[PDB]
Enzyme design. Structure first.
Site, PDB file in Angstrom:
ATOM      1  N   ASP A   1     -20.643   4.666 -17.175  1.00 37.58           N
ATOM      2  CA  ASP A   1     -20.316   3.246 -17.313  1.00 37.58           C
ATOM      3  C   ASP A   1     -21.157   2.429 -16.333  1.00 37.58           C
ATOM      4  OD1 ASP A   1     -19.183   0.757 -17.658  1.00 37.58           O
ATOM      5  OD2 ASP A   1     -17.219   1.320 -16.852  1.00 37.58           O
TER       6      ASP A   1
ATOM      7  N   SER B   1     -31.761 -12.547 -20.798  1.00 37.61           N
ATOM      8  CA  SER B   1     -32.511 -12.433 -22.040  1.00 37.61           C
ATOM      9  C   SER B   1     -33.183 -13.760 -22.374  1.00 37.61           C
ATOM     10  CB  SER B   1     -31.588 -12.011 -23.187  1.00 37.61           C
ATOM     11  OG  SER B   1     -32.275 -12.046 -24.426  1.00 37.61           O
TER      12      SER B   1
HETATM   13  N1  LIG Z   1     -17.801  -1.432 -18.617  1.00 35.95           N
HETATM   14  C1  LIG Z   1     -17.092  -1.902 -17.446  1.00 35.95           C
HETATM   15  C2  LIG Z   1     -16.817  -3.398 -17.559  1.00 35.95           C
HETATM   16  C3  LIG Z   1     -15.850  -3.866 -18.434  1.00 35.95           C
HETATM   17  C4  LIG Z   1     -15.608  -5.228 -18.529  1.00 35.95           C
HETATM   18  C5  LIG Z   1     -16.337  -6.113 -17.753  1.00 35.95           C
HETATM   19  C6  LIG Z   1     -16.087  -7.614 -17.835  1.00 35.95           C
HETATM   20  F1  LIG Z   1     -15.130  -7.880 -18.773  1.00 35.95           F
HETATM   21  F2  LIG Z   1     -15.673  -8.051 -16.611  1.00 35.95           F
HETATM   22  F3  LIG Z   1     -17.248  -8.244 -18.172  1.00 35.95           F
HETATM   23  C7  LIG Z   1     -17.302  -5.644 -16.881  1.00 35.95           C
HETATM   24  C8  LIG Z   1     -17.545  -4.286 -16.788  1.00 35.95           C
HETATM   25  N1  LIG Z   2     -15.518  -0.471 -19.953  1.00 36.92           N
HETATM   26  C1  LIG Z   2     -14.912   0.684 -19.316  1.00 36.92           C
HETATM   27  C2  LIG Z   2     -13.994   1.322 -20.348  1.00 36.92           C
HETATM   28  C3  LIG Z   2     -14.422   2.426 -21.064  1.00 36.92           C
HETATM   29  C4  LIG Z   2     -13.588   2.996 -22.010  1.00 36.92           C
HETATM   30  C5  LIG Z   2     -12.336   2.452 -22.235  1.00 36.92           C
HETATM   31  C6  LIG Z   2     -11.419   3.073 -23.280  1.00 36.92           C
HETATM   32  F1  LIG Z   2     -12.160   3.393 -24.382  1.00 36.92           F
HETATM   33  F2  LIG Z   2     -10.837   4.199 -22.775  1.00 36.92           F
HETATM   34  F3  LIG Z   2     -10.458   2.165 -23.619  1.00 36.92           F
HETATM   35  C7  LIG Z   2     -11.912   1.342 -21.526  1.00 36.92           C
HETATM   36  C8  LIG Z   2     -12.746   0.774 -20.580  1.00 36.92           C
END
Ligand SMILES: NCc1ccc(C(F)(F)F)cc1
Ligand SMILES: NCc1ccc(C(F)(F)F)cc1
Length: 330
Positions: free
Chosen positions: A35, A199
């Protein structure tokens, strides 16, 4: 040193990607969601509330000869989708595709939200944003990438996500056989802890390219592409019968429609997302309404270049002292 690991979609829609990671001595292999939008390495464990575990592989620190409890440390995280988890912290040896880090903070989940319990294929997350977002208290901990940086041949990792197919995460080197043409690099702001970049615009299908600055984050941990309402309205206006559905929570379209491609700008270069990448299938089993892979960021507060966009490119996360992002066609 370098590392290389295959990453695999968890289902037929590419909702997420899992990568095997070795933790502890002897190795315990867990499938983690890499992630770049978060900075915690956390796992289902023997400490997780039993009713909250449904098929996941668990990390058992008591069976690792290298595990050490980090006295007094706790963690608690909330993701942008409303999911959350929390627990305590161990340090242990963590290896990704041949690349080993000793003394990595491994955050053991005591409690996880329902969305994690219901995902039997994801054993935890491996955060790859900047370490300023790590939630360990009272002593912040470093990500796997930050800990590995010194020993890497080059302080980079690359994401090569597949469309309905396996892909590759590489650490410490750039595979010049994995992309076509040249890599275009663009500046990154770390002020919010994300791989945040700008972008240079977009195009819908074969339409004219609109030069306009779209600030957003490169997030392997988010499934879809979240863009400003003006851009998203321009895209779905080209799909006959598409509409924003409040009950569904986003744009839907008739499953019989063909979707146009979406182009986004990286400096003077262009990345083209094929229309098929934007189809996320029926909103419910048997429905003839399908869910769109491009959605509005209006309710989120930030634009998110998630897997829909990233899997159309070879992406370089350059963690040099001045960090940059590289995009190439493939
Ligand atoms: N994949 C992690 C993640 C999930 C959500 C956000 C948000 F909503 F804050 F932009 C940032 C990072
Ligand atoms: N962005 C981080 C994240 C990754 C996977 C999930 C899930 F799929 F488990 F819901 C939630 C949040």
């Amino acid at each position: 040193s370098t590392g290389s690991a295959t990453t695999t979609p968890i289902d037929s829609l590419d909702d997420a990607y899992i990568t095997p990671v070795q933790i502890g001595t002897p190795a315990q292999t867990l499938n983690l969601d890499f992630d770049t939008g978060s900075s915690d390495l956390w796992v289902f464990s023997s400490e997780t509330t039993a009713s909250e575990v449904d098929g996941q592989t668990i990390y058992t620190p008591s069976k690792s000869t290298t595990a050490k409890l980090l006295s007094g440390a706790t963690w608690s995280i909330s993701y942008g989708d409303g999911s959350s988890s929390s627990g305590d912290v161990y340090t242990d040896t963590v290896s990704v595709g041949g690349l080993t880090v000793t003394g990595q903070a491994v955050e053991s989940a005591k409690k996880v939200s329902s969305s994690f319990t219901e995902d039997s294929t994801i054993d935890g997350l491996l955060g790859l944003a900047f370490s300023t977002l790590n939630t360990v208290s009272p002593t912040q901990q470093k990500t796997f990438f930050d800990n590995a940086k010194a020993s890497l041949d080059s302080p980079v990792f690359t994401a090569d996500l597949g469309y309905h197919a396996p892909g590759t995460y590489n650490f410490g080197f750039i595979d010049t056989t994995a992309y076509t043409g040249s890599i275009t690099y663009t500046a990154v702001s770390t002020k919010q802890g994300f791989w945040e970049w700008t972008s240079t615009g977009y195009a819908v299908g074969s339409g004219t390219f609109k030069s306009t600055s779209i600030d957003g984050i490169a997030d392997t941990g988010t499934t879809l592409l979240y863009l400003p309402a003006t851009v998203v309205s321009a895209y779905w206006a080209q799909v006959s019968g598409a509409k924003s559905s409040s009950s569904v929570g986003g744009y839907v379209f008739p499953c019989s429609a063909t979707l146009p491609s979406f182009t986004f700008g990286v400096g003077s270069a262009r990345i083209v997302i094929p229309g098929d990448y934007i189809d996320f299938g029926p909103i419910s089993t048997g429905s003839s309404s399908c869910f769109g892979g491009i959605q509005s960021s209006a309710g989120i507060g930030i634009n998110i270049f998630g897997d829909v966009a990233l899997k159309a490119a070879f992406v370089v996360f350059n963690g040099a002292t001045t960090p940059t992002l590289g995009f190439a066609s493939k």
